[PDB]
């Protein structure tokens, strides 16, 4: 009989195409079977959509729209190679998002949107660009780190979400430790904020992360700072500036809420 | 630097007063005859306020010297159109511009 | 066609096996179609056995066993939903010690000389985790402190128990029935 | 057809027109050449006006070699004969020229020294007529793009010319301008003292002062009496009219003389300040020839002519507008109907790649570049390319993609990034949302109905190059979306109707070229969300009349489409499923 | 051979190098399309392994060194003079084979293309050379489409050099493909590259083909042929009028075309000479026609502004009177009875002249030829004869299309061959020899 439903129409059309011809396009085969699975998994669509649905009152419509526009600009900045104009746009977008009140009063909305993750891949791409040599756009990287720290301070759930990305931050904790006036705007600072004043996250901290931090501290204590001595500072045999940062991170790891984590 | 040649005469009495909004249809051409802009292509009359620095000064003066309902050919030298820098991607540096401008309405 | 698509994706030379939501979905679909789960009589048991054989033939007559082997080889010893779904599908196809499926897998392995399959198998075994007393103690300390886990229950102790069980069950099913050839091949 | 011959071709587009088809051909199984075609077959015809084109490598009479300039010898383009002194060898005047012109200044001002050398606007080239070739049969000078006079008896006295005389009201002639398309002097007349041509061949040097538009000629170091005064902005092609009386005929020597630029400096903007002579590969020798076709237009202007009366005379009336898209070749100063590129394989490929580059430079939200491109490709051009049925498929796809990328890609991607997110303001409109339209639990058409989920705002900036606001570089340029959507619906309906019978003349030459760009444009419009209510209902009926009816004619889903068209239909069905999920989410919130 | 140590004692294995280069190209040949998927994957894996081994052994640097040592010479003739014949006619082939080998070595290999970033600047410096242009272009295309780090080093000068390659070598779509790769790679746009390419390629409008929408223009003429010749019996002076009942200035986005005047044939041939026969061109767009648009005198597709009392573009209720003088070659116009301060003169008089008007859509005009074929709104100048007096006794005065083909049905269209020369239009009584 007639399908009379989009689900049935799609299902029998895909089956008929597949059994009528041997499709030579892997992309076409993938699209056909994705459509078939979507038709046969109607509940799965809701299972995927409800985590990403969110309701708001009529008052916050305008500033929610403004936040969504800013987040759309930031997301569009992903498919563009990073430059000075891109840095300016990202800085102004992050500033607008911070100035918007919905960012404060709806942390769950931000977490569902995954904008912290978006800033995270922005930072990882920019660090990878010139990871070997001196990184570019320190102002933008500092702004991203400040945004991530603020996200961590907003709520505990955001803190856990950012803690889920701890391994990379400790891997690239040596971004701007030497540079002064950038304090509080470093991936190490983001990791410290993610592990700050949260006992369950201090417990979730594992030995390899602390081992990496101690390895970095040992390297700083063994060698001088290349960029300091390049500026022309005396070549002492160690790196107090970065050692202090690593010691501060270890302090945050071992001390929480006025009591020491014994393990 | 702007020189004007009539094509279809206007009323000859009404002229754009200061602070008015001139509504025109313009077709832009380079000196070699290659079109670069035309409001008739977009099918939307171009509105601009006189003396408020909204358009290039050559077009500004050409529209100022025009009566209502008139059609004119305005030639603008580079120093009154875009200077030595030009417009990136559309007008080359040191380019003289020719505009076929019809003054539809004044408001 | 679907199985050929998955097999070509697995056979494509890649540094790492990317996650494929389509692959998880359809591997689960095929595994469920295979297994399809007052004592039953001998006639009922024979009916169930022959029905399972027919359902397994529906897949292994279209390259499902080769697909499973290729995906396991492409996993390169990295645990994840890819290899988990692949192992579940392999178990579904090999349930009951399917001699035809065992023969097909052994023939494919011998004719391809796939060292990567066994290398990835060893890597998966090494990556399989065990009980973590440190994690258990930390979780017990958290519970004593009383902090409510709004997220899911902490599974850091023996994370992929079901994955370990299904990997070793797939290994056992590969040798069920005293399959001497594949026992020696392992 | 020869002299005074009249014929009529019938391709059998209408079988009833054929008068002898039934007698012989119908029973034998012969089909008319246009038995299954929805358009008139384009007819090409031999071109009456000769045109300049590059000398072929397999030409039976002409051979051209490019001697590279040495440290002491200037670069040379040597024009030489192939089969002189043999049977049926054509002995006729041939018209050679250089592929690139020298353009005079827009406004006429009214040992070599380096400063004068760099600041001069005077260019030189020379033509060396070889010894043994009679100079009386060789003409050296300049021509414009208007030269098309192929005459076996060429002489300077039959050159097309005119004089425009401008004076004021009281007579008093103010200016007299002589205008022609050929500016040459005969080598035989230019010689004057008879010599043996043994120390060197005849070396006639042509000099153009472009700042003054002055053309002068030098015979053997002495200025000839003949000179020319060309108009401003005149493009003069170096040229030689030679009749072959020797194997080796002449050389375009692209050298220089004292205090004069070479020709390459004038021809190429990159080498404008380079006094070193050059012969880049773009500069080649073209010759006048008749071996080329012309494309007859598929539609002519409708002209009404009637003798009104003895007093009123003859009335000629024309009202129906017609337009064609003209492609201009810059270095040749000529234009051609873009529909003629269906047989110009190199130009078609280059223009398709140019369209791809246009897409690339504005790809991924480069609104400034999009506004810049709006000057080169405008809305009339885009709409004409979209509608035209005789456009080559490559250009059709390129122009569809260019339209989408300039005007629609930014907002389409902006909404696609959010599509998987559902932010529902909780208002009375949201509360009014229900899962099913009425008590009868029948699914409504996807897309239609009230939707309250937050979506990005759609804004566009009007592209104008006379303003200096510097604020329109945000947002994509404005396009007539209402015209675009209506025209797309009409075009897709026509495509479905004509392809249901599977004609042999699809738009673009293939059914994929017919459907892929049009369906892509329709999908982009759907993604942007311009379609609403009635238009969506019509297009859903086009997609599938049976399922999507509101409570053989086959929709696209059952038309036996190719693989790219199947992929695009999969995209459309994916969007419809996404719309259904969006509606479900809104209804769930409303109940909640 | 360099450093002025030229001799025949040197060893130059030209044939061995050529054979080894051919073998290497065959060794690095990519798999073909018709192969099965598994074989294609195996061949790709083997090729990638070969490329990695060669790169780790530093073969790319050796190939670059060979390329540099070969380009120290200007051309094949120079290399032949320096080294000998066999080297001279093997120079170009060896260089092309080396470039092909480099492209095969670095094609599809991210690591190799990333390593080639340092040498990219040296590669682009020799694009202008005709010998190595195609090979350098292919190598650059491979590197750019593979390595983002390749794009991260491209500056304004390199893009300008590529655009100059377009300017000096002609229309090559591979250059456009290279520019597209510069603009976008791996789904990531580069604003710097996009802006540079736009600003350095588009505004010139001198390399890429330019597109414009142009109104169709039709031309109409009476069946009257006016000519001057020795021994002819044709009156020299002629006069006619056109009155414009209606004209829409802008039927479309392009200005309406309407020109009036005289056009000449090509040597007693009835059809108009030297003009486009389909559309876009009107009176005065060649050197065979002379037109007047109300503001300009058109001839040779060049317009000169001409003064007249209350000068304006041709509009409704305009009478344009055209006067032709073949005795002293002249064409004059009068608009609404007052003279137009401009004139055509000293043109070719070896053909046949006729009244002509050209137009786009949106006009309504009326030819006034005098007599029963229209009534003149003004008085023709003394000694000027109206155009209706030139009709042959058997011929009937008619206004028809200037060109052969018009809007008809396809199967009713009359395809026409070449037309016989109209010698009978000009009458010259010829004596017998004496």
Short mmCIF file of N, CA, C and O in Angstrom, two decimals, chain E residues 139-194:
data_model
loop_
_atom_site.label_atom_id
_atom_site.label_comp_id
_atom_site.label_asym_id
_atom_site.label_seq_id
_atom_site.Cartn_x
_atom_site.Cartn_y
_atom_site.Cartn_z
N UNK E 139 54.76 20.30 -8.64
CA UNK E 139 55.34 20.08 -7.32
C UNK E 139 54.70 21.01 -6.29
O UNK E 139 54.35 20.59 -5.18
N UNK E 140 54.54 22.28 -6.65
CA UNK E 140 53.91 23.24 -5.75
C UNK E 140 52.48 22.84 -5.45
O UNK E 140 52.03 22.95 -4.30
N UNK E 141 51.74 22.38 -6.46
CA UNK E 141 50.37 21.95 -6.23
C UNK E 141 50.32 20.79 -5.24
O UNK E 141 49.50 20.80 -4.31
N UNK E 142 51.19 19.80 -5.42
CA UNK E 142 51.21 18.67 -4.49
C UNK E 142 51.52 19.13 -3.07
O UNK E 142 50.81 18.76 -2.12
N UNK E 143 52.56 19.95 -2.91
CA UNK E 143 52.95 20.39 -1.58
C UNK E 143 51.84 21.19 -0.92
O UNK E 143 51.54 21.01 0.27
N UNK E 144 51.20 22.09 -1.67
CA UNK E 144 50.17 22.93 -1.09
C UNK E 144 48.92 22.13 -0.73
O UNK E 144 48.32 22.37 0.32
N UNK E 145 48.52 21.18 -1.58
CA UNK E 145 47.33 20.40 -1.26
C UNK E 145 47.60 19.40 -0.15
O UNK E 145 46.66 18.90 0.47
N UNK E 146 48.87 19.09 0.14
CA UNK E 146 49.15 18.13 1.20
C UNK E 146 49.44 18.79 2.55
O UNK E 146 48.87 18.38 3.56
N UNK E 147 50.33 19.78 2.60
CA UNK E 147 50.84 20.29 3.87
C UNK E 147 50.27 21.65 4.20
O UNK E 147 50.45 22.60 3.42
N UNK E 148 49.55 21.80 5.32
CA UNK E 148 49.19 23.15 5.78
C UNK E 148 50.40 24.02 6.10
O UNK E 148 50.36 25.24 5.90
N UNK E 149 51.48 23.42 6.61
CA UNK E 149 52.69 24.18 6.88
C UNK E 149 53.27 24.77 5.60
O UNK E 149 54.00 25.77 5.65
N UNK E 150 52.98 24.16 4.46
CA UNK E 150 53.35 24.76 3.18
C UNK E 150 52.62 26.08 2.97
O UNK E 150 53.21 27.06 2.51
N UNK E 151 51.32 26.13 3.30
CA UNK E 151 50.57 27.36 3.15
C UNK E 151 50.96 28.39 4.19
O UNK E 151 50.87 29.60 3.94
N UNK E 152 51.40 27.94 5.37
CA UNK E 152 51.74 28.88 6.43
C UNK E 152 52.96 29.73 6.11
O UNK E 152 53.22 30.71 6.82
N UNK E 153 53.72 29.39 5.07
CA UNK E 153 54.91 30.15 4.69
C UNK E 153 54.71 30.98 3.44
O UNK E 153 55.56 31.84 3.15
N UNK E 154 53.64 30.76 2.68
CA UNK E 154 53.43 31.50 1.44
C UNK E 154 53.13 32.96 1.78
O UNK E 154 52.25 33.26 2.59
N UNK E 155 53.87 33.86 1.14
CA UNK E 155 53.75 35.29 1.39
C UNK E 155 53.14 35.99 0.18
O UNK E 155 52.72 35.35 -0.79
N UNK E 156 53.09 37.32 0.26
CA UNK E 156 52.52 38.11 -0.83
C UNK E 156 53.35 37.98 -2.10
O UNK E 156 52.80 37.92 -3.21
N UNK E 157 54.67 37.93 -1.96
CA UNK E 157 55.53 37.86 -3.13
C UNK E 157 55.32 36.60 -3.94
O UNK E 157 55.34 36.63 -5.17
N UNK E 158 55.12 35.46 -3.26
CA UNK E 158 54.89 34.21 -3.97
C UNK E 158 53.59 34.24 -4.77
O UNK E 158 53.54 33.80 -5.92
N UNK E 159 52.52 34.77 -4.16
CA UNK E 159 51.25 34.87 -4.87
C UNK E 159 51.37 35.83 -6.05
O UNK E 159 50.81 35.59 -7.12
N UNK E 160 52.11 36.93 -5.86
CA UNK E 160 52.34 37.85 -6.97
C UNK E 160 53.12 37.17 -8.09
O UNK E 160 52.85 37.41 -9.27
N UNK E 161 54.09 36.33 -7.74
CA UNK E 161 54.85 35.60 -8.76
C UNK E 161 53.96 34.64 -9.52
O UNK E 161 54.08 34.50 -10.74
N UNK E 162 53.05 33.96 -8.82
CA UNK E 162 52.13 33.04 -9.49
C UNK E 162 51.19 33.81 -10.43
O UNK E 162 50.92 33.38 -11.56
N UNK E 163 50.68 34.95 -9.97
CA UNK E 163 49.81 35.76 -10.82
C UNK E 163 50.59 36.31 -12.02
O UNK E 163 50.05 36.42 -13.13
N UNK E 164 51.86 36.64 -11.82
CA UNK E 164 52.70 37.05 -12.94
C UNK E 164 52.94 35.91 -13.91
O UNK E 164 53.08 36.14 -15.12
N UNK E 165 53.02 34.68 -13.40
CA UNK E 165 53.06 33.51 -14.28
C UNK E 165 51.81 33.44 -15.15
O UNK E 165 51.89 33.19 -16.36
N UNK E 166 50.65 33.68 -14.54
CA UNK E 166 49.42 33.78 -15.32
C UNK E 166 49.52 34.88 -16.37
O UNK E 166 49.10 34.70 -17.52
N UNK E 167 50.07 36.03 -15.99
CA UNK E 167 50.11 37.18 -16.88
C UNK E 167 51.05 36.95 -18.06
O UNK E 167 50.78 37.42 -19.17
N UNK E 168 52.16 36.25 -17.83
CA UNK E 168 53.20 36.13 -18.85
C UNK E 168 53.13 34.85 -19.67
O UNK E 168 53.63 34.83 -20.80
N UNK E 169 52.52 33.78 -19.15
CA UNK E 169 52.42 32.54 -19.90
C UNK E 169 51.03 32.28 -20.47
O UNK E 169 50.89 31.41 -21.34
N UNK E 170 50.01 33.01 -20.02
CA UNK E 170 48.69 32.86 -20.60
C UNK E 170 47.67 32.26 -19.66
O UNK E 170 47.78 32.38 -18.44
N UNK E 171 46.67 31.59 -20.23
CA UNK E 171 45.56 31.03 -19.47
C UNK E 171 45.85 29.56 -19.19
O UNK E 171 45.69 28.71 -20.06
N UNK E 172 46.28 29.27 -17.96
CA UNK E 172 46.57 27.92 -17.52
C UNK E 172 45.72 27.62 -16.30
O UNK E 172 45.84 28.30 -15.27
N UNK E 173 44.85 26.61 -16.40
CA UNK E 173 43.95 26.28 -15.30
C UNK E 173 44.68 25.65 -14.12
O UNK E 173 44.15 25.66 -13.01
N UNK E 174 45.87 25.10 -14.34
CA UNK E 174 46.65 24.58 -13.22
C UNK E 174 47.06 25.69 -12.27
O UNK E 174 47.11 25.47 -11.05
N UNK E 175 47.34 26.88 -12.80
CA UNK E 175 47.64 28.02 -11.94
C UNK E 175 46.43 28.38 -11.09
O UNK E 175 46.55 28.69 -9.90
N UNK E 176 45.24 28.36 -11.69
CA UNK E 176 44.02 28.62 -10.93
C UNK E 176 43.80 27.57 -9.85
O UNK E 176 43.35 27.88 -8.75
N UNK E 177 44.10 26.31 -10.17
CA UNK E 177 44.00 25.25 -9.16
C UNK E 177 44.97 25.49 -8.01
O UNK E 177 44.63 25.28 -6.84
N UNK E 178 46.19 25.92 -8.33
CA UNK E 178 47.17 26.24 -7.29
C UNK E 178 46.66 27.38 -6.42
O UNK E 178 46.80 27.35 -5.19
N UNK E 179 46.05 28.39 -7.04
CA UNK E 179 45.50 29.50 -6.26
C UNK E 179 44.34 29.04 -5.38
O UNK E 179 44.19 29.53 -4.25
N UNK E 180 43.51 28.12 -5.88
CA UNK E 180 42.44 27.58 -5.06
C UNK E 180 42.99 26.82 -3.85
O UNK E 180 42.45 26.92 -2.74
N UNK E 181 44.05 26.04 -4.07
CA UNK E 181 44.70 25.36 -2.96
C UNK E 181 45.29 26.35 -1.97
O UNK E 181 45.27 26.11 -0.76
N UNK E 182 45.83 27.46 -2.47
CA UNK E 182 46.32 28.52 -1.59
C UNK E 182 45.19 29.09 -0.75
O UNK E 182 45.36 29.36 0.44
N UNK E 183 44.02 29.31 -1.37
CA UNK E 183 42.89 29.90 -0.66
C UNK E 183 42.37 28.97 0.43
O UNK E 183 42.20 29.38 1.58
N UNK E 184 42.11 27.71 0.08
CA UNK E 184 41.47 26.77 1.00
C UNK E 184 42.24 25.45 0.98
O UNK E 184 42.57 24.95 -0.10
N UNK E 185 42.51 24.90 2.16
CA UNK E 185 43.13 23.60 2.29
C UNK E 185 42.57 22.88 3.51
O UNK E 185 42.52 23.46 4.60
N UNK E 186 42.16 21.63 3.31
CA UNK E 186 41.64 20.78 4.39
C UNK E 186 40.45 21.43 5.10
O UNK E 186 40.29 21.31 6.31
N UNK E 187 39.62 22.13 4.33
CA UNK E 187 38.44 22.76 4.90
C UNK E 187 38.70 23.98 5.75
O UNK E 187 37.80 24.42 6.46
N UNK E 188 39.91 24.54 5.70
CA UNK E 188 40.27 25.71 6.48
C UNK E 188 40.65 26.83 5.52
O UNK E 188 41.50 26.64 4.64
N UNK E 189 40.01 27.99 5.69
CA UNK E 189 40.26 29.13 4.83
C UNK E 189 41.40 29.98 5.38
O UNK E 189 41.62 30.06 6.59
N UNK E 190 42.12 30.63 4.47
CA UNK E 190 43.21 31.54 4.81
C UNK E 190 42.80 32.92 4.34
O UNK E 190 42.79 33.20 3.13
N UNK E 191 42.47 33.80 5.29
CA UNK E 191 42.04 35.15 4.94
C UNK E 191 43.15 35.91 4.22
O UNK E 191 42.88 36.66 3.27
N UNK E 192 44.39 35.75 4.66
CA UNK E 192 45.50 36.45 4.03
C UNK E 192 45.62 36.07 2.56
O UNK E 192 45.70 36.93 1.68
N UNK E 193 45.63 34.76 2.28
CA UNK E 193 45.73 34.31 0.90
C UNK E 193 44.53 34.76 0.08
O UNK E 193 44.69 35.19 -1.07
N UNK E 194 43.33 34.66 0.64
CA UNK E 194 42.13 35.06 -0.09
C UNK E 194 42.19 36.54 -0.46
O UNK E 194 41.95 36.92 -1.62
#
